[PDB]
Amino acid sequence: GMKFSKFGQKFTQPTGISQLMDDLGDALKSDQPVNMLGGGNPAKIDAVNELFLETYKALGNDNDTGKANSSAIISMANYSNPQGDSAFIDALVGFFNRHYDWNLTSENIALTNGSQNAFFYLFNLFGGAFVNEKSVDKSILLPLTPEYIGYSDVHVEGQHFAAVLPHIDEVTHDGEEGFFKYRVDFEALENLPALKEGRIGAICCSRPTNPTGNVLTDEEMAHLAEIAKRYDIPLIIDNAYGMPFPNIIYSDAHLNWDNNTILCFSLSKIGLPGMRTGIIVADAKVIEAVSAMNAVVNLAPTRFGAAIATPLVANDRIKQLSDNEIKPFYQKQATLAVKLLKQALGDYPLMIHKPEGAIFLWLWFKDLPISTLDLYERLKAKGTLIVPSEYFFPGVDVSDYQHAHECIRMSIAADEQTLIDGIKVIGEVVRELYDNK
């Protein structure tokens, strides 16, 4: 009746991620109450919203006497340049140069409709079909998996990711056992054939990581920069939950840049996800590409998130908000979740990834009699929503890797009572599964 192109058939195709996203969106839009521990929406932090309401009001009250011209109206009533809101870009240049001495200019920053829009651009700019120097497909290299589920399907044709599986070390957290950290396997990575065949167009990772809450160490990051410069490809770093804002990082870490680094940031995780504002810091050549892409796909990127954020970047309040209100909120939430998980399981073979950042806990059930896609169904049936591990391994076949079927992602951004009720159910279901064969 209505014929779509090959392009349309790819976005119309059912997938494991597409079915899962339908289920998350169905509960959010439904009457049946649920224990929502499966989304990525930030927490409702009161001190944060009080600052945003003040900034909002101020933008509508700075007009000249008896005249329409408030900042709120100017931002609404006009298209930004395709590269993004000029004032916000200038504010960002000043901010980054004050705090890190990178010597940026406005040519080094672009805005997109959320970081997701930035990955849609960046992964189709450095992956997919390249001219053979007669056509050669190159991949985005994820040096460590599990990694962000949202990367998976952004390519315009086929799928173009290469991943290296991680080394697992059992570690300690707050004086107790039953924790672990994923580490980059440089033996596997440095010897990766795709890299020597010239089939890798970029390296990319999130810091801290969705879904694990893992923070790749400064030594791991410096090593990745060497590999990136060696193979003459950019190192893309997704700071959605990281420095300098919202700075939801609990372990020692430093933010760096050079002309070979592409740094992505967002306003979603400081509490402005409805605004859809991503920020890219890169070499002039990358910013030009993104700006041209915005011109064609979007005309101009959105600017209301840039309007609220601008004065908060100018006076460093965006940093104070992050360090004083956002970071502590999520740490107390993660500590409470760990406490409750250890009360439910703890005698059982549950491992919790060292919570070093972001808004999630990553739970690993060693030798569980069912897969975590199965646990996901059983928990959804009882009103508790979590995300199963098998969709966080883009670029690697996990049908033959059992660790990929033994974990779940749980949001610690949910309110206290949701965490209490959700973890109670997770405990009952899982204990009952371990107690029988």
Ligand X SMILES: Cc1ncc(COP(=O)(O)O)c(C=O)c1O
Chain contacts with ligand X (rule: CB under 6 A): 40, 114-116, 148, 150, 206, 210, 238, 240, 266, 268, 273, 278, 299
Residue 115 labeled ligand binder? yes
We find the least distance from the C-beta atom of residue 426 to ligand X, in angstroms, to be 21
Among 42, 41, 39, 37, smallest CA distance to 419 is for: 37
Residue 116 labeled ligand binder? yes
For residue 21, give the amino acid letter. Answer: M
Nearest 10 degrees: Cα torsion 241, 247, 253, 254: 100
What is the rounded distance in angstroms from the CA atom of residue 249 to the CA atom of residue 80? 32
The stretch near a second copy (CB under 8 A) out of 11-19, 91-99, 387-395, 422-430 is 11-19
Q: Which of residues 219 and 232 has its CB atom nearest to a second copy in the complex?
A: 232
Q: Which of residues 150 and 388 has its CB atom nearest to ligand X in the complex?
A: 150
We find the least distance from the C-beta atom of residue 436 to a second copy, in angstroms, to be 38
Peptide bond into 246 cis (omega under 30): yes
Angle, vertex CA 252, rays to CA 313 and CA 335, nearest 5: 90
Count the site residues for a second copy by CB under 8 A. Answer: 91
Q: Which of residues 286 and 425 has its CB atom nearest to ligand X in the complex?
A: 286
Tell me the sheet residues that pair with 426.
Answer: none
Torsion-angle region of residue 383: left (phi > 0), alpha (psi -120 to 50) or beta?
Answer: left
**293 touches a second copy by CB under 8 A:** yes
Q: Tokens for 414, please give them.
A: 């949910």
Rg value, the chain, Cα? 22
We find the least distance from the C-beta atom of residue 364 to a second copy, in angstroms, to be 27
Q: Which of residues 68 and 381 has its CB atom nearest to a second copy in the complex?
A: 68
Residue 276 labeled ligand binder? yes
Peptide bond into 14 cis (omega under 30): no
Find the DSSP H helices in 317-356. 317-321, 327-344
Q: Which of residues 116 and 247 has its CB atom nearest to ligand X in the complex?
A: 116
Residue 269 labeled ligand binder? yes
**177 touches a second copy by CB under 8 A:** no
For helices 327-344 and 416-435, the axis angle rounded to 10 degrees is: 30
Question: CB–CB of 385/37 below 8 Å?
Answer: yes
Interface with a second copy in residues 86-105 (CB under 8 A): 86
What is the rounded distance in angstroms from the CA atom of residue 58 to the CA atom of residue 44? 22
Residue 71 labeled ligand binder? no
Tell me which of 37, 154, 224, 341 binds a second copy, using CB under 8 A.
154
Q: Which of residues 28 and 188 has its CB atom nearest to a second copy in the complex?
A: 28
> From the CB of residue 109, how many other CB atoms can be counted at a distance below 10 Å?
24
Tell me which of 84, 143, 146, 150 binds a second copy, using CB under 8 A.
150
Q: Which of residues 210 and 372 has its CB atom nearest to ligand X in the complex?
A: 210
Residue 139 labeled ligand binder? no
Peptide bond into 273 cis (omega under 30): no
**6 touches a second copy by CB under 8 A:** yes
| 206: partner contacted, choices ligand X, a second copy, none (Cβ within 5-8 A by kind) | ligand X
Residue matched to tokens 């391994």: 393
| 332: partner contacted, choices ligand X, a second copy, none (Cβ within 5-8 A by kind) | none
Annotated binding site: 79, 115-116, 148, 210, 241, 266, 268-269, 276
Annotated binding site for pyridoxal 5'-phosphate: 79, 115-116, 148, 210, 241, 266, 268-269, 276
